Amino acid sequence: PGGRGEAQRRKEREELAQQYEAILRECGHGRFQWTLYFVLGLALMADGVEVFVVGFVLPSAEKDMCLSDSNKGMLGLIVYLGMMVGAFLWGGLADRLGRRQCLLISLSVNSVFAFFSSFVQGYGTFLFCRLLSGVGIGGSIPIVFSYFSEFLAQEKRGEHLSWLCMFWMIGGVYAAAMAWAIIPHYGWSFQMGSAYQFHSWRVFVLVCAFPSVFAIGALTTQPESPRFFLENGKHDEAWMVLKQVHDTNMRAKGHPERVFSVTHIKTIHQWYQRWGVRALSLGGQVWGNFLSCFGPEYRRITLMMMGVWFTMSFSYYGLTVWFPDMIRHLQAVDYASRTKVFPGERVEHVTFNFTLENQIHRGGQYFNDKFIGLRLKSVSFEDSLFEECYFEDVTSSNTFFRNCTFINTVFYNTDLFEYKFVNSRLINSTFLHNKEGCPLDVTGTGEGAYMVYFVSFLGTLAVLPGNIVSALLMDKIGRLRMLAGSSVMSCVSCFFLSFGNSESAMIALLCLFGGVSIASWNALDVLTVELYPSDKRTTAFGFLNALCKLAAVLGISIFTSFVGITKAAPILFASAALALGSSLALKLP
Amino acid sequence: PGGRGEAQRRKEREELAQQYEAILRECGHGRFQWTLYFVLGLALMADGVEVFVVGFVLPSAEKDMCLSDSNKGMLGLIVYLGMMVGAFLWGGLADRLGRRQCLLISLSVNSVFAFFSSFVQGYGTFLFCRLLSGVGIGGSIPIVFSYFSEFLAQEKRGEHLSWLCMFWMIGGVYAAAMAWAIIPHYGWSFQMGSAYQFHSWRVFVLVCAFPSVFAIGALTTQPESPRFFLENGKHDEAWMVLKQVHDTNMRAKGHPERVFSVTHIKTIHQEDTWYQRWGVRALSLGGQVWGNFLSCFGPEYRRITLMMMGVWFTMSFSYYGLTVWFPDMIRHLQAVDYASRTKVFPGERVEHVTFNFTLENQIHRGGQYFNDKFIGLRLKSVSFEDSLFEECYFEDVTSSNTFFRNCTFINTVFYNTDLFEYKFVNSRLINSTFLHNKEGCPLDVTGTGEGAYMVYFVSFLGTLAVLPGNIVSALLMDKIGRLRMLAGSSVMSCVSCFFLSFGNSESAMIALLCLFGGVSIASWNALDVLTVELYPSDKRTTAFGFLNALCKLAAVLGISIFTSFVG
Ligand SMILES: CCC[C@@H]1CC(=O)N([C@@H](CC)C(N)=O)C1
Numbered sequence A: 001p002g003g004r005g006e007a008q009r010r011k012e013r014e015e016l017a018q019q020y021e022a023i024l025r026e027c028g029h030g031r032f033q034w035t036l037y038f039v040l041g042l043a044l045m046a047d048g049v050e051v052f053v054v055g056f057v058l059p060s061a062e063k064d065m066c067l068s069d070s071n072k073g074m075l076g077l078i079v080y081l082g083m084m085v086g087a088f089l090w091g092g093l094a095d096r097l098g099r100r101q102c103l104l105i106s107l108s109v110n111s112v113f114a115f116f117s118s119f120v121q122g123y124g125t126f127l128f129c130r131l132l133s134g135v136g137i138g139g140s141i142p143i144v145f146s147y148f149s150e151f152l153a154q155e156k157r158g159e160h161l162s163w164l165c166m167f168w169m170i171g172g173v174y175a176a177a178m179a180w181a182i183i184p185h186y187g188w189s190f191q192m193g194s195a196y197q198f199h200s201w202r203v204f205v206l207v208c209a210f211p212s213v214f215a216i217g218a219l220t221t222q223p224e225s226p227r228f229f230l231e232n233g234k235h236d237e238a239w240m241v242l243k244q245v246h247d248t249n250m251r252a253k254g255h256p257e258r259v260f261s262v263t264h265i266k267t268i269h270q271w272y273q274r275w276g277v278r279a280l281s282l283g284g285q286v287w288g289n290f291l292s293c294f295g296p297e298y299r300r301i302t303l304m305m306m307g308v309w310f311t312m313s314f315s316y317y318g319l320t321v322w323f324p325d326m327i328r329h330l331q332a333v334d335y336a337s338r339t340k341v342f343p344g345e346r347v348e349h350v351t352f353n354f355t356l357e358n359q360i361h362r363g364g365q366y367f368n369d370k371f372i373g374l375r376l377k378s379v380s381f382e383d384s385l386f387e388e389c390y391f392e393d394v395t396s397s398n399t400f401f402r403n404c405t406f407i408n409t410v411f412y413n414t415d416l417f418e419y420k421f422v423n424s425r426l427i428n429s430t431f432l433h434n435k436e437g438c439p440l441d442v443t444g445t446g447e448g449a450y451m452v453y454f455v456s457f458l459g460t461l462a463v464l465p466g467n468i469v470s471a472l473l474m475d476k477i478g479r480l481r482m483l484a485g486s487s488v489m490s491c492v493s494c495f496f497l498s499f500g501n502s503e504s505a506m507i508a509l510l511c512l513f514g515g516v517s518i519a520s521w522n523a524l525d526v527l528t529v530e531l532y533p534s535d536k537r538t539t540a541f542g543f544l545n546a547l548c549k550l551a552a553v554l555g556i557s558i559f560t561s562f563v564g565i566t567k568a569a570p571i572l573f574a575s576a577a578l579a580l581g582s583s584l585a586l587k588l589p
Numbered sequence B: 001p002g003g004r005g006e007a008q009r010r011k012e013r014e015e016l017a018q019q020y021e022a023i024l025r026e027c028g029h030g031r032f033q034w035t036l037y038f039v040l041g042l043a044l045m046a047d048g049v050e051v052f053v054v055g056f057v058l059p060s061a062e063k064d065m066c067l068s069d070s071n072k073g074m075l076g077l078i079v080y081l082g083m084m085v086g087a088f089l090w091g092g093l094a095d096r097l098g099r100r101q102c103l104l105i106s107l108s109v110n111s112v113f114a115f116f117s118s119f120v121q122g123y124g125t126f127l128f129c130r131l132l133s134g135v136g137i138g139g140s141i142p143i144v145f146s147y148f149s150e151f152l153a154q155e156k157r158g159e160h161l162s163w164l165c166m167f168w169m170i171g172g173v174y175a176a177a178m179a180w181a182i183i184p185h186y187g188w189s190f191q192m193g194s195a196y197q198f199h200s201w202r203v204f205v206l207v208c209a210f211p212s213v214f215a216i217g218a219l220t221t222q223p224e225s226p227r228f229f230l231e232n233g234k235h236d237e238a239w240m241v242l243k244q245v246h247d248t249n250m251r252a253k254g255h256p257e258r259v260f261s262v263t264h265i266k267t268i269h270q271e272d273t274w275y276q277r278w279g280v281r282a283l284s285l286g287g288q289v290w291g292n293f294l295s296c297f298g299p300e301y302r303r304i305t306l307m308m309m310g311v312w313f314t315m316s317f318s319y320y321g322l323t324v325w326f327p328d329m330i331r332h333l334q335a336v337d338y339a340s341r342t343k344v345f346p347g348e349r350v351e352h353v354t355f356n357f358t359l360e361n362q363i364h365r366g367g368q369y370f371n372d373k374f375i376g377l378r379l380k381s382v383s384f385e386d387s388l389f390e391e392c393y394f395e396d397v398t399s400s401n402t403f404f405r406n407c408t409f410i411n412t413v414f415y416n417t418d419l420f421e422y423k424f425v426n427s428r429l430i431n432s433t434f435l436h437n438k439e440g441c442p443l444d445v446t447g448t449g450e451g452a453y454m455v456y457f458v459s460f461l462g463t464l465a466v467l468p469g470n471i472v473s474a475l476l477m478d479k480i481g482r483l484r485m486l487a488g489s490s491v492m493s494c495v496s497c498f499f500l501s502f503g504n505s506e507s508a509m510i511a512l513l514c515l516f517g518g519v520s521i522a523s524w525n526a527l528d529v530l531t532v533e534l535y536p537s538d539k540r541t542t543a544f545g546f547l548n549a550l551c552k553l554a555a556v557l558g559i560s561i562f563t564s565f566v567g
């Protein structure tokens, strides 16, 4: 009856899955599948570029648009919730709208909103644009892995999906290289002037938007996954795509290129008035799929998969957010440690045309001597007085004056504002030709992370070959122990993250550990891909990735709620969870 | 007959080996084997901590222990000589005393004399105490490999003899981390009733001995390997041990012990004054051990023994590197980092000003105070050389990390300060008034190699990061088979371009250490697994310990010849 009807139904589902796998291994493995791998790797490169941007290059935005210190955590948190909701929504949509269609829509949204963020001024608009780029990038992996799976035979599935993390890593490397090239240096970016405004921040975002636009440009050529066509009652285009597959694979290598007759013979043998209605129907289909993800068939497998994904989330956070946060903190303490105090600049009426930086005066006194050529770069005076020391066309940078006076001294073209100069004595302290207005200070602490960007660049670049080694190596272990190796990797990652106290040592160790961590993530990704049915592969993958992102953003929330004094408690929680989940959460079919 | 008898013994060697490997294959695996692996790995943890101590920590700290100029460099060489003779002696002795007995006595020597070294004063006595500690610990790796391999089947040896490296590096990590935790800190050794204030590295040496104590306390449950019992010529105890381990391991899997226990009874049927007594025992055992070792150089094993000695020479420059080469560059990098971090302080004093600011790392030279007097001024890290201070009256001022040389004062009275004549070596005692002053016993050790304060941290991360590059390397060279050379070459080329890509800071040396120690020690494990399978158990431990002693000699002579050539 109904129960036996469903029994024969999923029996035929298994039969057709076997038949599709037979068709796939009949087509082969050649140029077409590697071209598709390169295109989906461009997509993963875009995803990695946005991950790097959000996790690494957030602290450079207070030089513009008046970014407050308390709202950086809010920006990161809301972008991670954007990635979460995007991953969940696009994963749910793909299995009832298309793997290529949803991937194209997500990449178009990401590219358009990244471009818009590159051309917005107010902080609110930039935050909104990054939030809506979050959904576009979060929708990538659940519709890249689960869409490249159906184009690969069983024997080559795990081996060739294990190499998709290399493109994520090279995307991180590309983003770091652009950051190092154009954010610090003023020779690569310049202000247009009257026609437009261009700081190194905008050019950085605009150039980081490029991998996404190339991915969407190259994604058009590849066709929709045949399995989706087969499941959605669409037969002719399935024949078309499979014919494209074997011909492209077999033109280079494969004797049957001469004639495909018998095999293709077997292949053919096998506006709210409607927009609102279709949106509601799509929502109903996605809700049905998500609810059936917790049915009697997958009541326990999905739960164990959740546990194994939670196992991984405490290394993804450490590599993506914890590492650059720690590097930034260490660079901050280093730049606080470095000092340059000038007691005075007394000279016998000799002009000083030389340029100096980091001038700080502590109780310095001037005997009413006029000095020409003084430079104010990274200058933070304290308890200092000036006597007729005015200079024409003086350049001001990082001017933070407090408890200091400038009696009978007038400066031109300075970044000083009313709020910058408070609680200090002043008489006739009026500055002419002042550049008052929107704060656009050059070298205004946005150039203070040059070493941070260089460290991130070389760390990721060196992770890349270690990642090559680890990815080439992990495929040797049997599939029953790749996730055990993942748990071991996470345990070692946490056992280090409980020990973070140095700069160069942390660079080297987190770099040589990025290889094993990233090579080990794809083992879990492959395990998630193979197990779930092709109808529910993308929902389940997106749902588990959404819980990985939820764990990451909850770690971010606690870390930003209590920072500095308490950092290692989440790592203790991580190690305890790893120990608890390595005992009985490895009985996965 | 003689010739017929020796021919029969040689031809029955294969039969007895087949019988014992069949017994091992039929006994089971999963509980006893893993508990044995854990206990013997915790015993190898002691060798790891000892080798780390002697390599990285021991040669530097000499000031508190009252060592001489040449002894400060000779200490490591002498400790390696002691570990040499210890490895040779215990490897030879383990083939006549037994498996567990020699391991127990070797770890007991390690524990007792490490404690005695932690509680000793005087350079010669400490030198001899660490010599005997090295003697005790040298024969800990050959005995552990032999005793552990006598409990595993022919195919199953690799997947445990490869993972003993896990505990070796766990020991390295523990020793390095614990050194980094204790060596800088001073309050871990708070004790009352004694005037002597020893440095905190005494507690470090004391806590390095705890792995040996834990191994001794855990080795009592594990019985001696039955293969030694069979080779000696006694059966009942061997059958006891075999049946007990089978009963212990029956819980893990399904083993039909009903008939398997029967054949272990008769497997041997086909496989055949008090101090004066102790002296006779000792001389007889020494002669028998010498003859047993001389049998290895006999033509029955000549070619393989010579090839093995050759590969032990070849596979030892990695040990030399990881022991002496990389610590030199690491400590030089740390020292130059500290030098760059500090700045020159020729003198910042100003007349008739409230110069109450605190200055760190006072390295003033020629900046004599011109009758400068200040009140409530704090001085830290005071180090003056031929500098005369006039009218410097400070009361209730605390100083630390102050060392003097060629120092002098003019009308300077110090109260509650750390200044003392202990650091006044080759310095004038002019105006050294110390009335109404707190005791100023200065610190030591850190004066020798001042840049080695957090070198233990970079060593700890090196030894820790060897692991993530260690499991992967072990699987790579354990599974692929005949493509190991190509895989290793590719990984080394990638690591070399990795190292060149590190052109930002002094992280390239840590990365090189980690990613080359991983491959080096994977290759070491390959060599060990190769050594254990070839030699028979009667001549296994003695041969492997002799090879280990030869490796120690290669390392010592290498450091000596590079000292002669370099510089
Ligand atoms: C986004 C949260 C972790 C992601 C999950 C996922 O699928 N990841 C891939 C990226 C190609 C990997 N590095 O294996 C890491």
Ligand SMILES: CCC[C@@H]1CC(=O)N([C@@H](CC)C(N)=O)C1
Pocket (backbone or CB within 6 Å): B044, B141, B162, B164, B165, B166, B168, B169, B318, B319, B322, B520, B521, B524, B525, B528
């Ligand atoms: C660089 C030092 C190499 C050591 C020497 C040695 O004997 N090693 C074995 C035995 C546990 C290993 N870790 O496999 C590694």
